[PDB]
Amino acid sequence: SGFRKMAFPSGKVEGCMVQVTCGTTTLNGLWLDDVVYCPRHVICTSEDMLNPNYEDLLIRKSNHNFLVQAGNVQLRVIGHSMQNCVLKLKVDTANPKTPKYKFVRIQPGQTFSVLACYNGSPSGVYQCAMRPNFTIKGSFLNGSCGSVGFNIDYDCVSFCYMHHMVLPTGVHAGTDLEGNFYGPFVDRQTAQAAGTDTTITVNVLAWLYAAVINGDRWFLNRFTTTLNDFNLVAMKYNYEPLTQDHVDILGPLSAQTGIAVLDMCASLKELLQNGMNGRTILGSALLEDEFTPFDVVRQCSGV
Amino acid sequence: FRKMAFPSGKVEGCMVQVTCGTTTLNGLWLDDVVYCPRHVICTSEDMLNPNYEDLLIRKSNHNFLVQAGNVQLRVIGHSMQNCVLKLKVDTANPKTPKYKFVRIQPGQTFSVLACYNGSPSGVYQCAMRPNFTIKGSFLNGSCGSVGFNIDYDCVSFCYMHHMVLPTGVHAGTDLEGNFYGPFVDRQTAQAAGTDTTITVNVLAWLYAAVINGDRWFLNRFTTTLNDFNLVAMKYNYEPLTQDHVDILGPLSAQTGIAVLDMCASLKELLQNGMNGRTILGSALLEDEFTPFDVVRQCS
Ligand SMILES: *[C@@](O)(CO)[C@H](C[C@@H]1CCNC1=O)NC(=O)[C@H](CC(C)C)NC(=O)c1cc2c(OC)cccc2[nH]1
Ligand SMILES: *[C@@](O)(CO)[C@H](C[C@@H]1CCNC1=O)NC(=O)[C@H](CC(C)C)NC(=O)c1cc2c(OC)cccc2[nH]1
């Protein structure tokens, strides 16, 4: 019963957050085994960040230039390398609370939990989606760099995001844990625009099914649509196309509710053309697109 | 603005499962006591119309299975406190945080750590409604999940889950076992009173809008607290208390907008509507962010 934007429990990640400081620059790092991972622009001064030659700036640093604090303990750095936009500090102590983990690069439209941290201290946890334009609508303040995004399956933490940048529009950009940005962004102190921000259609459909499972059907209709005719209307409204894989992925929700996927497409088509007429769905006045089909299935299966 | 939960790790380290017969739910292990909903002692048929004092008389310490994961914690004492059971166990939890038990007011927010079989599953922010329900997300097996706030290093537990209502909202107790609202722990359909909008939180939201430069709704008027409360009630808004006025103090100081001037602005929004305008990008006035949440997300 109910449907809420839900994050994974954050404790396995909290036990890995540390504080990294180089010069007057401080941000968060992720301590796994005997390595601390953090945004490489920590090595930068304020003047460097405008056009940093990172390889040039890094070679001029020594292991002792990096102060890593874990709680009240300082960890001694005994090596350091760079992998794209991520710095890897070898420390002489393995983190005893390292969980089972993997690094993965998430696909646009997928969700993950963010543990927002400041000065190496966890501050809040929330769910995000990787948008089609590879930005995320995060909540991050000064000092949040190095905060990470993750999913958990059984006991294994899959890290997928590390935070680097806020755009002029107030959305956020970052990298995977191999240091590659999501999107066309660069770790330099410049104002950057993203590509056009399309709506994650398969997710909107999942959330409509969640609304039905929770007792709201006001937006359904007796009509159907073909997949192509739906996509024509969806693209007109800057929605992503729905693929046959999306249709299949929605199967379990369609089975649970008895609403054919293309019948829900016809409902969404009507909502796009007519608007919501001051009504709300699951408490929202907008069509929500940051819950995946699996997000809905795991909260609403059996209800 | 977004709902943000507290990091959940300090609470995760306290979740256990408690079973009596085939009835299983979650409990909270702090020091050498495990707290859980007292209906764990019920068979399914017992929960239709339970006499808990009589049911408990028939239970002894050795009838309670407490597990941290798969590891059993031997129960060495038990007692009932309102609608919660307290099981003394022979092991003090080494992960016990600094904590307190608090009873919150409508409008206050908290994080819920939803758990199943003693295993944390998800975390999300909830607000206590004026009708003493929360809009949670809870499946079978979720009872005994807790809600909490974290202040510095101290976990303040405020909620333990017991009930879903026919409308699909949730009800529960504080950690002394006293329900929020008129609800009882019985297998029966129970109705919550009509709900109202949480005025103090809408005001916090309007302050948040002003902080971010969105201030078209500020008007030239003020009001008294009494006159405002009487108007607000005709729009299904809660009356403000003195505590509400006080907790708006910091946002009022930050923006320079007196609390009663902002109340007069809200009154105009209620009486005249939004005129197809938005506030913080929304035609809806948000009532699930407290003044603390607004400060916590702006700094
Ligand atoms: C990190 O904490 C820095 O360590 C920080 C996080 C942002 C602070 C405010 N909210 C955030 O998410 N990131 C930055 O400060 C980055 C630093 C880069 C990677 C060197 N820069 C930006 O976020 C950035 C710079 C500019 C800009 O310039 C000029 C103009 C407009 C936006 C903008 N963002
Ligand atoms: C706990 O897991 C029980 O241990 C369970 C939580 C609900 C299950 C599905 N989602 C939940 O939030 N709580 C219950 O099952 C309670 C048990 C009481 C305390 C003895 N029962 C209800 O919440 C319940 C019973 C009825 C009902 O009956 C008749 C009719 C309508 C609603 C309703 N809710």
Numbering used by the authors:
A (entry chain A): 1 to 303
B (entry chain B): 3 to 301
From the paper:
The SARS-CoV-2 main protease (Mpro) is essential for viral replication and is a primary target for COVID-19 antivirals. Direct-acting antivirals such as nirmatrelvir, the active component of Paxlovid, target the Mpro active site to block viral polyprotein cleavage and thus replication. Residue 166 of Mpro, although highly evolutionarily conserved in coronaviruses, is proposed to be one of the critical sites for drug resistance in SARS-CoV-2 Mpro, with E166 variants showing the largest decreases in potency against nirmatrelvir.
The E166A variant, which shows a smaller 30-fold loss of nirmatrelvir potency relative to WT, yields a smaller 9.2°C decrease in Tm compared to WT. In each of our determined structures, PF-00835231 was bound in the expected conformation with strong electron density observed for the covalent bond between Cys145 and the carbonyl of the hydroxymethyl ketone warhead of the inhibitor. In complex with PF-00835231 or nirmatrelvir, Glu166 makes three key hydrogen bonds to form the S1 subsite: between Glu166:OE2 and Ser1:OG, between Glu166:OE1 and Ser1:N, and between Glu166:OE1 and the nitrogen of the γ-lactam ring. Our structures of E166A, E166V, and E166V/L50F Mpro variants demonstrate two N-terminus hydrogen bonds absent in the WT complex: between Ser1:OG hydrogen and Phe140:O and between Ser1:OG hydrogen and the nitrogen atom of the γ-lactam ring.
